[PDB]
Design a protein around this ligand. Structure first.
Ligand SMILES: [Mg+2]
Length: 649
């Protein structure tokens, strides 16, 4: 067949997906063009006069995006209970007494500890409100961050060279289809079987071409009707423990319609649990995250993952070094651990557009414009504070025009790729400001065969130098960088942390990796999510892994001593033994703490690390399958043959 539509004229819900499960071998949708149409139901229908109904069958209307609701931190222990709060008080005070952060002027910890334990007096499930909204424009943020208005000529050349190498190489890799997250509109279900069947549809017959024709027409009704697609972001919230004494502000929902780049209001949330003020406790910090619909992202992800997998291979020293060897690598080398403020939101419009423009050299233009549509899409959010209502920001009916300019948009197939590449572009520009010819020597820099380079994990980076004069001029360059050179607001990172571990300065140019000592106790005592449920099915593993290496560092060992003793006195009599709780749940999960590598345990705690930190080769199938369905490259080879002109790696 040669059908161009995913949704044909066939009668809907006339077949059952249970009768056409995918066997890894043949794409049934090749044999039957009406199959996707028949196995799923009629859509509600898109009325351009009220686009929010895209999200109607999903959490609805008025429920807050971040409700105040106590977490189950451990089996039978809930975060709003006084006993817990009293425990947190005593633990933090005891842990502070046993260890204080010993930092030098460069920002390195000499003892391993980089901060106090005060943040563990945070009440999980009790959010700072309002959750800060996304303004229609970010130019006020660029101006507040005193960043460049545009890139310099040389920076545009450097960016073109690096993106040429990234878009120009692809290592075809399975599309990862997430099991536990929403498809977003129009179906708004957490159904990886549907997401997979949709993918088989898009990549069978002439559906991808048909999808793009509909996309580029600008006829939202047609694109929705025939491909169950609409260019619009839904909204989520991520929770984390806040840092004492940082400026806590937010963009109000009421302000974002009044001007494009409104100023920020102060968060004033206090912790009061049924009329009892906890003046020494913090509410959880909340951050708005967008999430793109599967039916938009599925068309972009092959390129995203293909380009990134090739990038990890061709330029491993920059983008995918053996994490366990980093400390040994930096030995005898000077190191700058960068810290970036509002990285992703601070991406200029020019930078997003340049990325997609260079991509058109290697990928069909309609695919890059689709990507451009999602980066700049309208979004719908449920209330962000208790006084707000639901809100559509932007006009999705005009999706071919830019609606929201929010930099490297969260929820986009390209988000991690963009994070990774632009941080290197920034840093390599600095190498060029130092008087080296980065264009001539670009591959050697990226492969790590020059006297200096950078080790990247998105906004987190290590810039390394064999020479002390290079290192010093680099620091000088940052202290004296004029605004027109300033791509991102970068400063040195207190504690010198990279990918979760403090790089302890144990001797002259000798570093030692230790996981941030606060992390274990934050993740237990102040979790983003309750144990179990959707995202925390494997929760005993992360705890037991950490507990089993408690003796591996002197400060870690003493803090764990204070956790155990304090838990034993203040918690155990009410809730039972800590290890009792952790081991009983341990025995319920399919993997032992000893069955798994540290990398596999991280993926089980955050599956999205499969999209940016680990490859298929490092994580066993049984672990990946816990969170993902997959569609192997052969099933979208045809699409690539037509739409990709780069090199296969
Ligand atoms: Mg860092």
């Amino acid at each position: 067949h040669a059908e161009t539509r995913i949704v044909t004229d066939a009668p809907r819900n006339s077949e059952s997906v249970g009768d056409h499960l995918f066997n890894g071998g043949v794409n049934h949708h090749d044999e039957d063009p009406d199959a996707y149409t028949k196995m799923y139901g009629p859509l509600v229908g898109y009325d351009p006069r009220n686009p929010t109904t895209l999200f109607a069958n999903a959490q609805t209307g008025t429920q807050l995006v971040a409700p105040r609701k106590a977490r189950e931190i451990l089996t039978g222990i809930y975060s709003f209970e006084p006993t817990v709060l009293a425990f947190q008080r005593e633990f933090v005070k005891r842990a502070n007494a046993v260890a204080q952060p010993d930092l030098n002027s460069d920002g390195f910890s000499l003892n391993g500890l980089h901060t106090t334990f005060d943040s563990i007096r945070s009440v999980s499930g009790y959010p700072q409100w309002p959750v800060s909204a996304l303004p229609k424009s970010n130019v006020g943020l660029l101006r507040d961050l005193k960043l460049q208005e545009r890139m310099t000529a040389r920076q545009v050349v450097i960016a073109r060279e690096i993106w040429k190498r990234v878009w120009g190489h692809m290592k075809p890799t399975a599309i990862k289809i997430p099991k536990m997250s929403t498809s977003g509109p129009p179906r708004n279900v957490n159904d990886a079987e549907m997401k997979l069947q949709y993918a088989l549809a898009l990549f069978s017959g002439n559906r991808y071409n048909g999808y793009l024709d509909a996309f580029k027409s600008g006829d939202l009704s047609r694109f929705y009707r025939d491909y169950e697609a609409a260019v619009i972001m839904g909204t989520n919230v991520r929770w984390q423990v806040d840092n004492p004494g940082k400026k806590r502000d937010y963009w109000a929902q009421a302000d974002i319609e009044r001007e494009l780049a409104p100023s920020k209001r102060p968060i004033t949330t206090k912790v009061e649990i049924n009329g009892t003020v906890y003046d020494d406790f913090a509410a959880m910090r909340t951050r708005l995250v967008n999430a793109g619909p599967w039916t938009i992202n599925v068309a972009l992800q092959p390129f995203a993952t293909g380009c990134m997998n090739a990038m990890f291979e061709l330029y491993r020293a920059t983008w995918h070094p053996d994490e366990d060897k980093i400390a040994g690598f930096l030995e005898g080398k000077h190191a700058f651990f960068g810290d970036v403020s509002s990285y992703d939101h601070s991406f200029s419009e020019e930078k997003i557009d340049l990325s997609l423009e260079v991509g058109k050299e290697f990928i069909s233009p309609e695919i890059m414009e689709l990507a451009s549509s999602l980066f700049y899409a309208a979004y719908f959010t449920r209330p962000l504070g208790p006084d707000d209502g639901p809100q559509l920001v932007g006009n999705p009916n005009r999706y071919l025009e830019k609606q929201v300019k929010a930099g490297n948009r969260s929820g986009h197939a390209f988000t991690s790729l963009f994070a990774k590449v632009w941080k290197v572009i920034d840093t390599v520009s600095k190498f060029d400001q130092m008087g080296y010819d980065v264009v001539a020597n670009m591959d050697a820099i990226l492969k790590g065969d020059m006297p200096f380079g950078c080790i990247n994990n998105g906004d987190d980076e290590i810039v390394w130098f064999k020479s002390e004069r290079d290192y010093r001029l680099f620091l000088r360059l940052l202290e004296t960088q004029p605004q027109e050179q300033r791509m991102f607001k970068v400063g040195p990172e207190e504690g010198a942390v990279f990918s979760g571990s403090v790089y302890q300065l144990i001797g002259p140019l000798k570093y030692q990796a230790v996981e941030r000592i606060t992390t274990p106790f934050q993740r237990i005592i102040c979790p983003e999510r309750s144990i179990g449920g959707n995202f925390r099915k494997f929760w005993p593993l992360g705890i037991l892994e950490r507990y089993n290496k408690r003796n591996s560092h002197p400060v870690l060992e003493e803090v764990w001593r204070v956790f155990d003793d304090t838990y034993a006195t203040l918690m155990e009599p009410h809730y039972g033994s800590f290890l009792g709780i952790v081991q009983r749940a341990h025995k319920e999960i399919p993997f032992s703490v000893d069955d798994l590598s540290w990398k596999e345990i991280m993926v089980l705690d955050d599956p999205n690390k499969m999209y940016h930190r680990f490859t298929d080769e490092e994580i066993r199938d049984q672990v990946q399958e816990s969170a993902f369905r997959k569609l192997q490259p052969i099933f979208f080879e045809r699409m690539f043959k037509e739409h990709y002109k780069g090199n296969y790696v």
